[PDB]
Amino acid sequence: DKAMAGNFWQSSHYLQWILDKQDLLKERQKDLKFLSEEEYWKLQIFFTNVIQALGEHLKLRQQVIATATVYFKRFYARYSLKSIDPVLMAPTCVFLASKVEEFGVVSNTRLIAAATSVLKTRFSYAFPKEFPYRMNHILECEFYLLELMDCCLIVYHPYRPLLQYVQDMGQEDMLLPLAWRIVNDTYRTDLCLLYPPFMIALACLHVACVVQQKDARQWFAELSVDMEKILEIIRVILKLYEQWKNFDERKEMATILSKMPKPKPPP
Amino acid sequence: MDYDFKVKLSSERERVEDLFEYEGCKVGRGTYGHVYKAKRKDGKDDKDYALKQIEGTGISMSACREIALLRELKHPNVISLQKVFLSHADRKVWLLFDYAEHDLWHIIKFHRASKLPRGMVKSLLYQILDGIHYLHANWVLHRDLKPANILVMGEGPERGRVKIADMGFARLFNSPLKVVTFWYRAPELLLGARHYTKAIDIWAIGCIFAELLTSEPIFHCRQESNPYHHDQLDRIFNVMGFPADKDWEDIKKMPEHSTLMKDFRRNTYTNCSLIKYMEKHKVKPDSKAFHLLQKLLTMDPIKRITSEQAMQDPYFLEDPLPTSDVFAGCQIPYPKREFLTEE
């Protein structure tokens, strides 16, 4: 789907959903009463992985999965984890993202079956009970999601600019698979809420070049871009890999999930 | 869901029935849903609004894509989404627009019923091309362009400005195959083209332009699965002539080409041409208007002009120049929309 491809600078993404880092951290403090900063990041990583598994099981293209991931992040950038259960929100984000695209639809029974099967087969370390929600909960949650994103549905990702950069380098076979995988990894951080996607793409490509010992200094010099911001993004990517190393998702998440604030019922 | 979160959002939610007076003010009902002429209940402004309750419940592909695209698109000749209201109780979606009193269907009928300043037709075409070009430059196809969907603003600050509406937002796999008229459908659609294209929109603009010039649909035929429609093709050939091999080399690649060859003979249409058709409806074939029309109504979609090139045509540099107000400051003779009282 190439809709709005050259419109980023007049887009809802750019104009409303490139957030201030200090505003984001300010809104986050409500949930940091229950969780440490490290625990909150681990929770973000976990639900990114959940959304990825849901999308893979549904056979969705990576761009749809990425859109679902940014819907999830946008929701919890603004609201508390207790507002709506993230176990319900994740499949809802996948459902809505799938409908913004045009090549195929995710049916109701297929979404619920995917949520149930994926959580059982790939996430039983986190979740002792089966997926408890039915399709009416997804549909209700979808209305809240759409409203609370201010109906902003078109999301730009680093994949398209990355492809253009790697083509321009003439290094598709060398650098693209690794750089693409590093783009996937950036969704385990806040970067998509903070930087234009092309900047994230350049940072991922830089790390790919360093890993593979490819000298691209002159090519990165030929770009008219704020390299200080690219370096900021690289530092977050390098930090993610150190956290990844020190994080055992499977051993820690049940404990972290129990510490999450939970939706208060009616009186 | 957190209860405090729920009651807070319920307290704060703007509801269409509380914000707008639209009871008994329905101006249209169709596949799109229900369209009302609305006014704000608090007197903050005195403007007229259009309120559309989308057909069905929940968020359909049509609704999802309509909201997704209109949330981003910003151009004077594309209808602007002002607000979205989500009604949780009945799962209904409401879209708010600035109200367009007129559209090309009703303008054309008004002229047809009579049997227009100098540059009205030209001004309409230019603005249609401007709006479609903006969509196309953003890789958005309209896919259902017709006189009924080309709105024109009435009295107010946007007097006589074209607003392209009803963009046909959801077509599975971008495919035309997945009371109907085929008068604005490009011949490649009729021969089984698997995907919508920019060229398909351009053909429809050509049809609309011919209709604005004559007040008659150029490829008129009877109304009413299979994309192949025999009588519609017959009508196109009776107007345009039958394409030579050299006119449309890739016609052989169309899935219904062999059906076309079975049903039609070239010789049937030997004295038929757009020149002769337009001569009968008092359009001069040596006019710049005609030469542009002929470029829009090219049978081979790869030989059809783009919206950009159409906007650059010297037709638009010839007196009279197109105007922002297509009525050119003259008094609007067209009647206002009537309200629907049918059950």
Ligand SMILES: Cc1ncc2sc(C(=O)N3CCC[C@H]3c3ccc(Cl)cc3)nn12
């Ligand atoms: C009158 C009007 N002003 C602004 C707007 S958007 C809007 C719409 O959704 N649509 C969908 C089909 C074509 C258009 C329309 C046009 C006329 C009428 Cl009677 C009803 C609907 N209609 N409309």
